[PDB]
Tab-separated table of N, CA and C and ligand atoms in Angstrom:
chain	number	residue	atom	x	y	z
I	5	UNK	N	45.310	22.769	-24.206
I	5	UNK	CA	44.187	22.507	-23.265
I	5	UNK	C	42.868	22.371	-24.027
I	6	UNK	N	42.259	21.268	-23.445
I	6	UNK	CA	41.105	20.780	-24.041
I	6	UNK	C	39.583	21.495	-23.425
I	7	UNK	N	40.146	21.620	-22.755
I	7	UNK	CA	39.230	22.493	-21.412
I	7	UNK	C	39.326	24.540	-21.501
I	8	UNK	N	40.059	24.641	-22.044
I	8	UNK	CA	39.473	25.962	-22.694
I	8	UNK	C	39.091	26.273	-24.028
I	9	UNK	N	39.373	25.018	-24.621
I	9	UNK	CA	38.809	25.057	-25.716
I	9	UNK	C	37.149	24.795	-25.930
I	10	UNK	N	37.104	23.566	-25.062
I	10	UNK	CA	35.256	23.730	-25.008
I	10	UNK	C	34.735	24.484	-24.072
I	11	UNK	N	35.265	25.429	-23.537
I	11	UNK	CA	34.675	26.936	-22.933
I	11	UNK	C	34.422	27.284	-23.709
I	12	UNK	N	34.998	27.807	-25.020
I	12	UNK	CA	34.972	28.819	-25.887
I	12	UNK	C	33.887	27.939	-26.964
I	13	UNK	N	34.026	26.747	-27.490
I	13	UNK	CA	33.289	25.923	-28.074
I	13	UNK	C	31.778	26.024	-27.411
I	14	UNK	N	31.581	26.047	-26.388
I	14	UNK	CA	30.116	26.072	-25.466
I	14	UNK	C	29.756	27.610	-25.896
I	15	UNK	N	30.098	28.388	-25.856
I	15	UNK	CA	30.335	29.857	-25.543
I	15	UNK	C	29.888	30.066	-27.367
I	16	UNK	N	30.888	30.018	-28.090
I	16	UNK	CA	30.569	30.263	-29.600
I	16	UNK	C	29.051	29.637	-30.169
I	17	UNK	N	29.460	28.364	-29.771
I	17	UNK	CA	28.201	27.409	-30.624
I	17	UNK	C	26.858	27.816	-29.951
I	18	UNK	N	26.561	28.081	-28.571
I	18	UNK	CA	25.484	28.655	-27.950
I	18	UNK	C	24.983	30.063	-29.350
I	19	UNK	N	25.930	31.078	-29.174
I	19	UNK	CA	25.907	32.072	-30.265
I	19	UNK	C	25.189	31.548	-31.047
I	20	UNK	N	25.657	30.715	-31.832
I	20	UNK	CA	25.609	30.495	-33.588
I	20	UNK	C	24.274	29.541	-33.667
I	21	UNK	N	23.792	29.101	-32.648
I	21	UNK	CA	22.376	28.664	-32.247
I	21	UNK	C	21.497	29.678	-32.051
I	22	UNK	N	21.855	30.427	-31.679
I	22	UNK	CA	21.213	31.771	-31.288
I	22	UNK	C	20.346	32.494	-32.060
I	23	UNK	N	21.969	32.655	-33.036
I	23	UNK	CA	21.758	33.531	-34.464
I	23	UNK	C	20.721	32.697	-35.408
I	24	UNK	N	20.992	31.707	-35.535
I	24	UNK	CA	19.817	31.131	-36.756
I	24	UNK	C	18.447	30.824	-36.300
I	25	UNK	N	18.021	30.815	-34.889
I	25	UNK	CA	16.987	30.712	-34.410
I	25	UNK	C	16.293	32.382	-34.036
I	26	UNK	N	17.213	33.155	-34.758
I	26	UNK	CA	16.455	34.906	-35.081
I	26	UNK	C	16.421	34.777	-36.312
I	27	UNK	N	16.645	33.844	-37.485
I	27	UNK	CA	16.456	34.287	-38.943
I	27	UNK	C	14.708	33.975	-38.998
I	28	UNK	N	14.600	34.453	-40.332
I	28	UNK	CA	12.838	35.055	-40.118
I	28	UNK	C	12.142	33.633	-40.409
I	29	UNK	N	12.485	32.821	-41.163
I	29	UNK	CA	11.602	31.647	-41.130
I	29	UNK	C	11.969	30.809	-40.705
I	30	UNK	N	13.370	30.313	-39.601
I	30	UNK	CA	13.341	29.625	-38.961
I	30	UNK	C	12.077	28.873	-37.806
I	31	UNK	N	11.997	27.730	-37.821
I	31	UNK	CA	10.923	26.977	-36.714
I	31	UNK	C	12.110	26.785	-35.479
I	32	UNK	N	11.693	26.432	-34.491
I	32	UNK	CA	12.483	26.401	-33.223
I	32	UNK	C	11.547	25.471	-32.529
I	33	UNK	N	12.205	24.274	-32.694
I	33	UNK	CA	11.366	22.784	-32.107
I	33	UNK	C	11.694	22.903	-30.345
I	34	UNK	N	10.664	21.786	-29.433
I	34	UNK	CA	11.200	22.210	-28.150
I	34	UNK	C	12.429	21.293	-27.686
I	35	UNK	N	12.772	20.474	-28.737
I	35	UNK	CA	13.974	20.063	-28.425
I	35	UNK	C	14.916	20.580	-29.162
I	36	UNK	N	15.249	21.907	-29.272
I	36	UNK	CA	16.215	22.251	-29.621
I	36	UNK	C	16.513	22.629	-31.017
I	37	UNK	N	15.747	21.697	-31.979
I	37	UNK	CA	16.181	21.241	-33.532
I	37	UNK	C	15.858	23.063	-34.296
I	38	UNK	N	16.455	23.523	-35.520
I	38	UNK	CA	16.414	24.586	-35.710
I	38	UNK	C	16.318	24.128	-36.940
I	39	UNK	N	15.454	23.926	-37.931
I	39	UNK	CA	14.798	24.388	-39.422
I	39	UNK	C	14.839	25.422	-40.435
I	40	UNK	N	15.304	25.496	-41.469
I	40	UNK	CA	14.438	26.226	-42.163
I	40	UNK	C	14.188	25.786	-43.562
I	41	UNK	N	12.671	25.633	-43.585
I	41	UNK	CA	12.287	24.946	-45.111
I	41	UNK	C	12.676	25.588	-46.436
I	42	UNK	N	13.628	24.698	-47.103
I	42	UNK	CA	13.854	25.587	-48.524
I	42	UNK	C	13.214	25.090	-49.649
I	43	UNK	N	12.641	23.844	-49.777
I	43	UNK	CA	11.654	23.525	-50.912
I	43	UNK	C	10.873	22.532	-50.270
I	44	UNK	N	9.200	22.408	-50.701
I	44	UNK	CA	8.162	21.741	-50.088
I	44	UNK	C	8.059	20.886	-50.884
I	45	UNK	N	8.008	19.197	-50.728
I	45	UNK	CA	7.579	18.248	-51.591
I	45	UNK	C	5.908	17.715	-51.748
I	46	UNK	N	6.267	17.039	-52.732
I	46	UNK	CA	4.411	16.582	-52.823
I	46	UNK	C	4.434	15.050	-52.087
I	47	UNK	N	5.364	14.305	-50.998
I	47	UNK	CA	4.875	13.478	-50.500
I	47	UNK	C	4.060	13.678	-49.203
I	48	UNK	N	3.072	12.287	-48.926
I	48	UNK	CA	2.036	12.615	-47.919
I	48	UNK	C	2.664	11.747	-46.972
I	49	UNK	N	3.313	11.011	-46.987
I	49	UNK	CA	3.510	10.324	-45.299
I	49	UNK	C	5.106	10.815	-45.249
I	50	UNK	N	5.726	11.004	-43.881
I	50	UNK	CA	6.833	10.674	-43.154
I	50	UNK	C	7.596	9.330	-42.781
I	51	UNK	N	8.450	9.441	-42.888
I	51	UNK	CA	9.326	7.713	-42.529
I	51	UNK	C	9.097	7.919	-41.107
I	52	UNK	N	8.821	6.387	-41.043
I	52	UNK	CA	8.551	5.736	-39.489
I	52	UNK	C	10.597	5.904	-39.283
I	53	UNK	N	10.157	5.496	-37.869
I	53	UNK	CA	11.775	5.432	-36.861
I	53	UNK	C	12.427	4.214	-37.639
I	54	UNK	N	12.187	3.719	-38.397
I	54	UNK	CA	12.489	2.074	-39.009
I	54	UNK	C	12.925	2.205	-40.695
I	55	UNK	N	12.262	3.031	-41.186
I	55	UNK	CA	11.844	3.037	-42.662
I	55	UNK	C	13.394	3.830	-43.180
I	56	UNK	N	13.650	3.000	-44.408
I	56	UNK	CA	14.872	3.324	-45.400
I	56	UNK	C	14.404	4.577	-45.951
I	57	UNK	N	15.466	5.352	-45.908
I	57	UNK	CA	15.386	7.011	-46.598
I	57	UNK	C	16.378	7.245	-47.877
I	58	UNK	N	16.410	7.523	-49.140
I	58	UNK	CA	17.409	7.897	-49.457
I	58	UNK	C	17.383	9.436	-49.498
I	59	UNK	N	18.570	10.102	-49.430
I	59	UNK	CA	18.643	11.343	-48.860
I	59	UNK	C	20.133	11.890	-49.453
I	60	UNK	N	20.348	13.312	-50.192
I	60	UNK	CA	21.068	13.872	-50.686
I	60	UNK	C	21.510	15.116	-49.458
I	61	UNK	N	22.370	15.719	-48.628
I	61	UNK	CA	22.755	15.891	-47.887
I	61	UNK	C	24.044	16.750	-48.018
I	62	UNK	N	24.328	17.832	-46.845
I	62	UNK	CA	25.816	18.156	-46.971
I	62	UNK	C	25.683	18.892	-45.502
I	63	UNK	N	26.644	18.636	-44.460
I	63	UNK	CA	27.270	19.190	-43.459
I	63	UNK	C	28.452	20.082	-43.388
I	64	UNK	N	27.996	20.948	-42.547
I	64	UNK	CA	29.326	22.131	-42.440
I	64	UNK	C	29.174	22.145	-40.659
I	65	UNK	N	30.553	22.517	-40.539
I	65	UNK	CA	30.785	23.027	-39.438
I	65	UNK	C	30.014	24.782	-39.060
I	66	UNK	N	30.124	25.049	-37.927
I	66	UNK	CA	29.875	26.318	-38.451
I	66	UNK	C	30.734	27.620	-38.072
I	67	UNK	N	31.659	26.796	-38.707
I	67	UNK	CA	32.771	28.122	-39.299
I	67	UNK	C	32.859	27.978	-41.051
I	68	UNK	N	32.256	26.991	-41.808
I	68	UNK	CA	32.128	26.944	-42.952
I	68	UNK	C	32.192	25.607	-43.141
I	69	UNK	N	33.227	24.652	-42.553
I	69	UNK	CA	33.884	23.302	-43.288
I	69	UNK	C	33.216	22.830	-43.435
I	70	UNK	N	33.330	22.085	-45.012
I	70	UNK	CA	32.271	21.040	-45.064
I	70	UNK	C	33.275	19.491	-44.547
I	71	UNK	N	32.309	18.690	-43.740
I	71	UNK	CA	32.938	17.451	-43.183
I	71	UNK	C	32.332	16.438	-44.154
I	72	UNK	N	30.988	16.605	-44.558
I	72	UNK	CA	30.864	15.221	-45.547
I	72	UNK	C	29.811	15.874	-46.389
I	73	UNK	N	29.693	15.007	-47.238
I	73	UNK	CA	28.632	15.521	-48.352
I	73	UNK	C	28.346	14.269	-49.480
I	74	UNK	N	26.866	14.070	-49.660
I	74	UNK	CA	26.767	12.895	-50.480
I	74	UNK	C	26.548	13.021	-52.133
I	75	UNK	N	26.810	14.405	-52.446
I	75	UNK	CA	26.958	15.270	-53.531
I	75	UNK	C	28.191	14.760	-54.379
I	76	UNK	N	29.046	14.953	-53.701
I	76	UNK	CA	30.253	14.404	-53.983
I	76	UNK	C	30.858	13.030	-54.445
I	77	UNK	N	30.143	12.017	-53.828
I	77	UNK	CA	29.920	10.820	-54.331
I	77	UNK	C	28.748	10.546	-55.097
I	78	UNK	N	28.121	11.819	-55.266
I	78	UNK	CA	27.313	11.704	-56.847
I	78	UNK	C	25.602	11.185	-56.596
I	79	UNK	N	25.618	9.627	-55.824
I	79	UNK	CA	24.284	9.356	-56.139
I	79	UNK	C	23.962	9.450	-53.994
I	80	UNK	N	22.546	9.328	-54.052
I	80	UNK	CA	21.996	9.719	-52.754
I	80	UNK	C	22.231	8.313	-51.486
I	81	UNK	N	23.012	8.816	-49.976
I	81	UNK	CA	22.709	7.579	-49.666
I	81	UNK	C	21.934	6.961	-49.042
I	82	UNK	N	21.683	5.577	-47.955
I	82	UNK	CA	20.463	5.366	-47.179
I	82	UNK	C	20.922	5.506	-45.901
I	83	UNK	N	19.851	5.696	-45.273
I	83	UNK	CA	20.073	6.046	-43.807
I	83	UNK	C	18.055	5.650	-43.317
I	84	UNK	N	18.695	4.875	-42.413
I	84	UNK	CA	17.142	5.245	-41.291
I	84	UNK	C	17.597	5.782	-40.020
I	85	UNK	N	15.931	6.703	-39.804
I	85	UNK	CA	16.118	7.222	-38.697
I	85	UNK	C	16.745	6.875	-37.540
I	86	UNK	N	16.087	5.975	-37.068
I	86	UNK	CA	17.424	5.035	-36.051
I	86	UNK	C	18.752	4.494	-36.134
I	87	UNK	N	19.178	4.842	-37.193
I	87	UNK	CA	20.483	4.668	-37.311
I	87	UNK	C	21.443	6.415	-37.154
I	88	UNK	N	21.099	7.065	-37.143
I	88	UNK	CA	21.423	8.811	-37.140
I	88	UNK	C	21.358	9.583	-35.898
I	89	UNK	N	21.835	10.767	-35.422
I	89	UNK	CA	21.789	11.595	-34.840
I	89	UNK	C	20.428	12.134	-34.305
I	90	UNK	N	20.189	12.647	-33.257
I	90	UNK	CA	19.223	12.674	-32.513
I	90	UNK	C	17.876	14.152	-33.736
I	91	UNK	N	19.113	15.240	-33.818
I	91	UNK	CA	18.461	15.862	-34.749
I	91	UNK	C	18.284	15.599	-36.181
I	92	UNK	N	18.528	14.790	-36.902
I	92	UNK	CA	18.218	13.497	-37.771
I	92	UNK	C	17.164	12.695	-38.042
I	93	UNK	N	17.216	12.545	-36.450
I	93	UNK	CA	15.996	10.809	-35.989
I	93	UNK	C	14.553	12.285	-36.267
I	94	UNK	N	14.869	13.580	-35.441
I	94	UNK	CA	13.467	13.826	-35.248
I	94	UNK	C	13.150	15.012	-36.560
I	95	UNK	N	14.136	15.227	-37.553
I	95	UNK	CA	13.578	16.239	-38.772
I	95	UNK	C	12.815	15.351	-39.839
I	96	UNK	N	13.860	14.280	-39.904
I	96	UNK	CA	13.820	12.681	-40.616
I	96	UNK	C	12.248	12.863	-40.385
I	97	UNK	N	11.579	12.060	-39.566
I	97	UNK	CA	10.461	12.034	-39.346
I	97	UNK	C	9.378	12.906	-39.440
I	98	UNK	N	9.814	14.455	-39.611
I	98	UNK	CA	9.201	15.323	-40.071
I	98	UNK	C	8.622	15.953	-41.724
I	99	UNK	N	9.713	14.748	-42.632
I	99	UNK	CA	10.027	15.100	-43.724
I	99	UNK	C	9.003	14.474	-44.654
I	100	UNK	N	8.538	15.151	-45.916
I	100	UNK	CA	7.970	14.390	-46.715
I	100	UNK	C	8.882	14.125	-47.906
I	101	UNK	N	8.537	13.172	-48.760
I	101	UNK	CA	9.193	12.967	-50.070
I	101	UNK	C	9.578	14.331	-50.921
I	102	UNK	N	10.237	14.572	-51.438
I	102	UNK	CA	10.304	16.305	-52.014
I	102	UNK	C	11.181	16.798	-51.248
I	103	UNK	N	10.554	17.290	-49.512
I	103	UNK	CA	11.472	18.201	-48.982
I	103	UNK	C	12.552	18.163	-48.695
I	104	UNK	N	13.068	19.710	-48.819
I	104	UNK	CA	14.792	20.090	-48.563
I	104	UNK	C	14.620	21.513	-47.561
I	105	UNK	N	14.826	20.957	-46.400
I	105	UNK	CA	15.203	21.448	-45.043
I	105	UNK	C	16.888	22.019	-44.732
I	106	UNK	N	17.538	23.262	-44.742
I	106	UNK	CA	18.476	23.503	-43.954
I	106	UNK	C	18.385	23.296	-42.111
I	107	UNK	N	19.102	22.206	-41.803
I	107	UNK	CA	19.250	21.776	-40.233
I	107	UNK	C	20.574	22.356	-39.726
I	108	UNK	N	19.837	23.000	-38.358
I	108	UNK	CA	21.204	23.477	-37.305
I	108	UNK	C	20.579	22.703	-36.233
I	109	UNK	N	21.476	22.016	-35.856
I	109	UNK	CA	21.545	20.821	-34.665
I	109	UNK	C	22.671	21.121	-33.563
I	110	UNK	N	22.214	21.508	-32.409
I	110	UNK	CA	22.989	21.820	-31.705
I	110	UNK	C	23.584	20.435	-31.109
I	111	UNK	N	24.824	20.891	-30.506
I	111	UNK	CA	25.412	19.815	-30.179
I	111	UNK	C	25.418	18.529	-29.045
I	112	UNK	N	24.219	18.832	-28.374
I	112	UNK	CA	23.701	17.674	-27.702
I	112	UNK	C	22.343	17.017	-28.396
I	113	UNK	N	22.345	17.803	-29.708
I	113	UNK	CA	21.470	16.922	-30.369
I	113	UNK	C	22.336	16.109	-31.989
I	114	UNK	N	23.734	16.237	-31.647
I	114	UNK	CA	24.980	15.920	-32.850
I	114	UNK	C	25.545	14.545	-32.044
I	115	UNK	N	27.304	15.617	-31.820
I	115	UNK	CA	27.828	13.958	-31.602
I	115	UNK	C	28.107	14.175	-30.048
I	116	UNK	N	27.662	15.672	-29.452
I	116	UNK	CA	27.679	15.924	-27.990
I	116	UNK	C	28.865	16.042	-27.655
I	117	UNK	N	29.655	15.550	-26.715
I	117	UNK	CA	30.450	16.125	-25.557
I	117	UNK	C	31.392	15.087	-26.052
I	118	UNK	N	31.775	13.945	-26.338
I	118	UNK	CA	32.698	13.359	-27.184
I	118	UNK	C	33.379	14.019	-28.740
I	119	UNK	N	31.645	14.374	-29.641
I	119	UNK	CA	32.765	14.837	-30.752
I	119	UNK	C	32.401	13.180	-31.707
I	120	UNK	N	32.645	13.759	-33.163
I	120	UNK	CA	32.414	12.847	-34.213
I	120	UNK	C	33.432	12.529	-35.056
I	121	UNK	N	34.067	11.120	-34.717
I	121	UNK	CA	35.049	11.160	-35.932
I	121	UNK	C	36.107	12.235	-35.754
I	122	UNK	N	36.644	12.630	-36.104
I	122	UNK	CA	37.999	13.255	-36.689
I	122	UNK	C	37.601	15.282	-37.076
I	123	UNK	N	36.859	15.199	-37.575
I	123	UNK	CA	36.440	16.894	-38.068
I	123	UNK	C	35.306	17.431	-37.298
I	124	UNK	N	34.747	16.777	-36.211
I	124	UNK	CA	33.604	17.332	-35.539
I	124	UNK	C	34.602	17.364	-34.174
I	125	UNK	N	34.240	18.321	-33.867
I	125	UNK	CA	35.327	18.932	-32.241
I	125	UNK	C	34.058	18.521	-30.918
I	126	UNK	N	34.615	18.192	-29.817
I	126	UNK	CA	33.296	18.391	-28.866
I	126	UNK	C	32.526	19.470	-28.694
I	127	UNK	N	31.395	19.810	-28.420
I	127	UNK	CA	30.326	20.660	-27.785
I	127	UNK	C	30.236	21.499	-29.450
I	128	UNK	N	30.127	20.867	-30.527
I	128	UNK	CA	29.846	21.569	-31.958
I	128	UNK	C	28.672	21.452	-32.397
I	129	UNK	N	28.141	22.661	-32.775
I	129	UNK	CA	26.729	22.593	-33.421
I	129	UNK	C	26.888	22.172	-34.767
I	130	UNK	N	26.519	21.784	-35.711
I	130	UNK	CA	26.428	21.245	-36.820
I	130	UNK	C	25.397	21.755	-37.729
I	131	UNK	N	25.678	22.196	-39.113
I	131	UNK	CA	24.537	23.051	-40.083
I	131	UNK	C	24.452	21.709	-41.719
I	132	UNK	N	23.421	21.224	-41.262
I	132	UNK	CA	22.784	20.262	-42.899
I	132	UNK	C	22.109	20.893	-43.565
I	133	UNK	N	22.094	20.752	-44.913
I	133	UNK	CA	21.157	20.495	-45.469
I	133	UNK	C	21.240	19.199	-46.201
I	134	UNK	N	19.442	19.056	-46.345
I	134	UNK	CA	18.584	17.991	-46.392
I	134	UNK	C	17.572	17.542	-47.386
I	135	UNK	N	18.044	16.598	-48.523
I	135	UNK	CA	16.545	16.567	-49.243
I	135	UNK	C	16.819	15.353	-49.201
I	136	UNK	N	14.793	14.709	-48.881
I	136	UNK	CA	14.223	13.250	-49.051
I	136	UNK	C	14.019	13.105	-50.231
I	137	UNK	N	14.869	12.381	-51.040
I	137	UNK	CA	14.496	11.793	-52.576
I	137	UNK	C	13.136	11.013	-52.552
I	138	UNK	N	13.538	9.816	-51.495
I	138	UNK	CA	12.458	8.790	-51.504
I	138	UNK	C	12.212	7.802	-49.691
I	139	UNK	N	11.462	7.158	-49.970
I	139	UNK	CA	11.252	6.105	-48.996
I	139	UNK	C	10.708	4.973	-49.169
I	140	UNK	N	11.453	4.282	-48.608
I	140	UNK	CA	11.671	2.553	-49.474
I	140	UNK	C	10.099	2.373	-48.980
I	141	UNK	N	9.330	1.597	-50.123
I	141	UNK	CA	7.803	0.761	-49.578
I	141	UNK	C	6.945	2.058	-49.389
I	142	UNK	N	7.271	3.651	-49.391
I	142	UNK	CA	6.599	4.320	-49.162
I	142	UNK	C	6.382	3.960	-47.331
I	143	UNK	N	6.458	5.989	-46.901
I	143	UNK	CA	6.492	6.273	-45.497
I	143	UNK	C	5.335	5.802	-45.011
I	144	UNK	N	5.592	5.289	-43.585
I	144	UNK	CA	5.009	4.504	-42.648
I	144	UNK	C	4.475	5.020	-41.338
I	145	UNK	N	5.118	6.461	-41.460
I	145	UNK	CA	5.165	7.341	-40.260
I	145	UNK	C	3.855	8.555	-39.988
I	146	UNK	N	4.529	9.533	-39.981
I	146	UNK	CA	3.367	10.829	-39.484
I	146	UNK	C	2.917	11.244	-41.155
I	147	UNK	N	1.293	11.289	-40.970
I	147	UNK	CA	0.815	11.616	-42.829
I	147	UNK	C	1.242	13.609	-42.193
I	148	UNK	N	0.715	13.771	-43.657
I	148	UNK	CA	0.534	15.559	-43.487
I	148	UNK	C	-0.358	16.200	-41.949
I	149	UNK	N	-1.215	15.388	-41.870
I	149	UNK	CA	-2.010	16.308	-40.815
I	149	UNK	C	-1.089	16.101	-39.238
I	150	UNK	N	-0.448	15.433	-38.933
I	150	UNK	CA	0.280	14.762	-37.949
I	150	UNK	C	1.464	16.243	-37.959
I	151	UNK	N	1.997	16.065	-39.027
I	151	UNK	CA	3.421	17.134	-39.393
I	151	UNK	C	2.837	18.237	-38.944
I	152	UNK	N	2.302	19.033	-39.594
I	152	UNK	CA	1.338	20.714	-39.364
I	152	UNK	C	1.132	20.932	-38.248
I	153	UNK	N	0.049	19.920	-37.058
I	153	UNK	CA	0.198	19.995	-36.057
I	153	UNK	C	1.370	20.260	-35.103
I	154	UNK	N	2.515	19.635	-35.538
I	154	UNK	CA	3.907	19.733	-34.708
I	154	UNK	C	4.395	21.260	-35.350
I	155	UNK	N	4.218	21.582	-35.909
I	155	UNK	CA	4.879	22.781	-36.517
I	155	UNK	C	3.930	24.144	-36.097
I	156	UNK	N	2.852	23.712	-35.966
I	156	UNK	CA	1.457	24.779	-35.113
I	156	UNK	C	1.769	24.805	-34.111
I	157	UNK	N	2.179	23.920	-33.098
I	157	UNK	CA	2.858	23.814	-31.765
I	157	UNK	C	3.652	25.184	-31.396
I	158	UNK	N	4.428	24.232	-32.882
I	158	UNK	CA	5.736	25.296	-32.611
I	158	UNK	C	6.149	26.761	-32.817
I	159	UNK	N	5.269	27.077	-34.293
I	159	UNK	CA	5.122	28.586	-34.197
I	159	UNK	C	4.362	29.401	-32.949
I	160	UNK	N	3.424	28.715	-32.008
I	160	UNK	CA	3.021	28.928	-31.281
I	160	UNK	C	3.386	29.090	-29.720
I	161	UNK	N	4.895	29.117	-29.647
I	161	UNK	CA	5.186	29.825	-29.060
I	161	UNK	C	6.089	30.620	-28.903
J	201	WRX	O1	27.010	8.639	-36.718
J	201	WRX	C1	25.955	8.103	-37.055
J	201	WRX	N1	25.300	7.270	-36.260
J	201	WRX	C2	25.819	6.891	-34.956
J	201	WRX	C3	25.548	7.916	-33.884
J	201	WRX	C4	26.554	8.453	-33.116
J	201	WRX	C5	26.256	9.385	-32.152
J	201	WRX	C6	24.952	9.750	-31.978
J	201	WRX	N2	23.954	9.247	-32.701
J	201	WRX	C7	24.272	8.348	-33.638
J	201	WRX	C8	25.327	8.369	-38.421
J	201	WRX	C9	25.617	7.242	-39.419
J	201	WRX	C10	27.068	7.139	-39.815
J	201	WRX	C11	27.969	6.414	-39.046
J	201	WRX	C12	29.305	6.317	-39.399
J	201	WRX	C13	29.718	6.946	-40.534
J	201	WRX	F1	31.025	6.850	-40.889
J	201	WRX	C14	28.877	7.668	-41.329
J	201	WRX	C15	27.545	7.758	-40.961
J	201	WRX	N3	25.722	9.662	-38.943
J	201	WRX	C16	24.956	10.741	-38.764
J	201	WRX	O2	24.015	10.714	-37.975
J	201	WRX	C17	25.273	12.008	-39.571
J	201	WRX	C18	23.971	12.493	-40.195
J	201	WRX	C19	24.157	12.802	-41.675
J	201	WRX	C20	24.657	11.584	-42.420
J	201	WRX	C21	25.912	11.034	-41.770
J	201	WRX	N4	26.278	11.887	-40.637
J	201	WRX	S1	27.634	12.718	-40.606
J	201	WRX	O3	27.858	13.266	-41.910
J	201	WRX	O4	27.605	13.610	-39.485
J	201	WRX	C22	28.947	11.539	-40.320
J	201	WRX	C23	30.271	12.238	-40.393
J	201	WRX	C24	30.864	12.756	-39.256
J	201	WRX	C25	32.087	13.403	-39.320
J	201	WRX	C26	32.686	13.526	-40.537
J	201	WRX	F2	33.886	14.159	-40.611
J	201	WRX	C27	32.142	13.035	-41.684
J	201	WRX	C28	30.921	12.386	-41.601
């Protein structure tokens, strides 16, 4: 049964959202997205919704598995925001050149109620981490003062 399985899937992953949105420097966006910054870069703009990213990366389930990782194939790959996951489209855009963000994306901000591919189950939260190598033409998007503001928001409440 597929149907007590995403009881328990709704039920766990709620938890495990829970838990990382009590660790001490987690941010807690109002859509959901769960952060925590592990190294600050020296770029000043953010990629627009459009703009080429290359990006070094690794996903786990969160019972441990890792499902993909671009480590492994050695060099970094591209992705734009609009081409990615909802919690993706909106950290993506948060990011400067340099930074490496651990992401917990709950699962209506993943692959949701369908499920991804083969190793992502329905109603699964998903744990990245994240570093922006670069951005093609240089970012187009939110400079530094734009970012801070969203993050003042957010410690703020
Ligand atoms: O699915 C995507 N866009 C379409 C879409 C669907 C639904 C909602 N919104 C958008 C993109 C682009 C992509 C498409 C097809 C691929 F084969 C690979 C990438 N992916 C991602 O957003 C995340 C983000 C981090 C990099 C890539 N992954 S990922 O690691 O989870 C993929 C993965 C999933 C399960 C695995 F076992 C292994 C790998």
């Amino acid at each position: 049964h597929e149907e007590r399985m995403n009881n328990y899937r709704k039920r766990v992953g709620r938890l495990f959202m829970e838990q990382k949105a009590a660790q001490p420097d987690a941010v807690k966006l109002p859509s959901g997205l769960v952060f925590q910054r592990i190294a600050r870069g020296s770029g000043k703009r953010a990629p627009a919704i459009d703009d080429k990213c290359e990006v070094h990366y690794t996903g786990r389930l969160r019972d441990g598995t890792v499902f993909d990782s671009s480590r492994e194939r050695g060099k970094p790959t591209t992705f734009r925001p609009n081409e990615v996951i909802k919690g993706w489209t909106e950290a993506l855009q948060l990011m400067r050149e340099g930074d490496r963000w651990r992401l917990f994306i709950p699962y209506d901000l993943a692959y949701g109620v369908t499920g991804g591919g083969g190793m992502i189950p329905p109603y699964s939260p998903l744990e990245f981490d994240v570093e922006l190598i670069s951005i093609k033409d240089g970012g187009k998007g939110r400079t530094a003062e734009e970012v801070d503001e969203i993050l003042r928001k957010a410690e703020e409440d």
